[model samples]
Target: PMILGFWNVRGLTHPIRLLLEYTDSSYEEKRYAMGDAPDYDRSQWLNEKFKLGLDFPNLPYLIDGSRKITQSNAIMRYLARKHHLCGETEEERIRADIVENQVMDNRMQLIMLCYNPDFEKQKPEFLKTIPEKMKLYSEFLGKRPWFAGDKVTYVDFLAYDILDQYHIFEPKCLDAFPNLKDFLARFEGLKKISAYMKSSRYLSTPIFSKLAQWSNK
Candidate 1:
């Protein structure tokens, strides 16, 4: 069963959930405590990832039927391809891989920033660097309706998460990237995604606590 395992927070699982809803597939998820490390929870860990062998590590693994998939991005694409959620051609699929590597880096780093709040003060240059990093990706999205081709691809969800969540705390973040802003807004407006957000399956957590971390006009 998909619920046979667990992961902490709404990491890579978030995008997969969107794709599943887009395809109307069935799955289950468990949100375990942060301390539930793969090695620390020996029995539970092994039960969840036994097929991945001893090197098995990390969170966000997927279980479907008798098959298990590790690595968030890999499983996301596999599911997309399995369900025809991926783009309709070869070049677009290659774009799927490229966008996953380049744009998904920002998603992982955003979580790291959440964990290390002192990063900017400790290294002020990392401050300007963070905003610049985001601007670059926003520019890319602004150039196209989706990541590749005229149709929606699985990669778009991954990129949308980056732009959507980042701009929540840092509204000034995407103000400079108007097209990316519209791109994300429209992506969220799509019938399937809009409906999915209202479903009970979606977590209603305030993703970026920083937005309300302070008071302002």
Candidate 2:
């Protein structure tokens, strides 16, 4: 079984967890709980960070047999390669690549706000941009069943996780993007995903650490 190390919160690891479950991969988690507010001590993770053989020694590290990997996207691609979910053709590959980076870019925007001290002051501006941001994704997805085309790729998981966050941030955000809403529904409708979601082991709270201004509402 693979060992995935990360903070107990969802953070960057939720999509990886979803991908693992979707692929039926054997895995276990090493969830490190962050300390309470004020200092928000991170000794829980920092204590074991350097002990692991990971090259970068970061949170969300995956140890599978002799192969150890870090970085969210690298781990996603590594697992995707094992399941042949990267994509099948050049066009699919291009779409997958584009969505992969684009999703990260959009995800970081919200993350930056959540962690910002001025979150309340900046939230309005952030909300104002939601429709425009969502519009791009709706246009990109168009009528495709998945972001990367007919086949489900790892980037779809990435897209789903980020888009879902936005939906939680603003419940009505997807009302205009019917295709995007359908995409979320279709992804959740998958057998493995739906099963995992309903399981006892699922962790859907605390999207960020206690240090964040907005976390796990």
TM-scores for every predicted model: 0.76, 0.97
Sum up the clashes in candidate 1: 0
After aligning candidate 2 to the native by TM-score, how far in Å is the CA of 122 from where it should be? 1.8
* Residues 75-159, model 1: lDDT tens digits: 7877877877777778877877778887667776666665565654654453455578777676655567888768887888888
Model 2 over residues 137-206: C-alpha lDDT tens digits?
9999999999888888999999999898898888999999999999999999999999999998798877
Give me the candidate number with maximum TM-score: 2
Q: Where does candidate 2 clash, by residue pair?
A: none
Which candidate's lDDT is highest? 2
Q: After TM-score superposition, what is the CA distance of residue 165 in candidate 2 from its true location, in Å?
A: 0.3
TM-score of 2: 0.97
- How badly does each model clash, as a count of residue pairs? 0, 0
Q: Rate the local accuracy (lDDT) of all candidates.
A: 0.65, 0.89
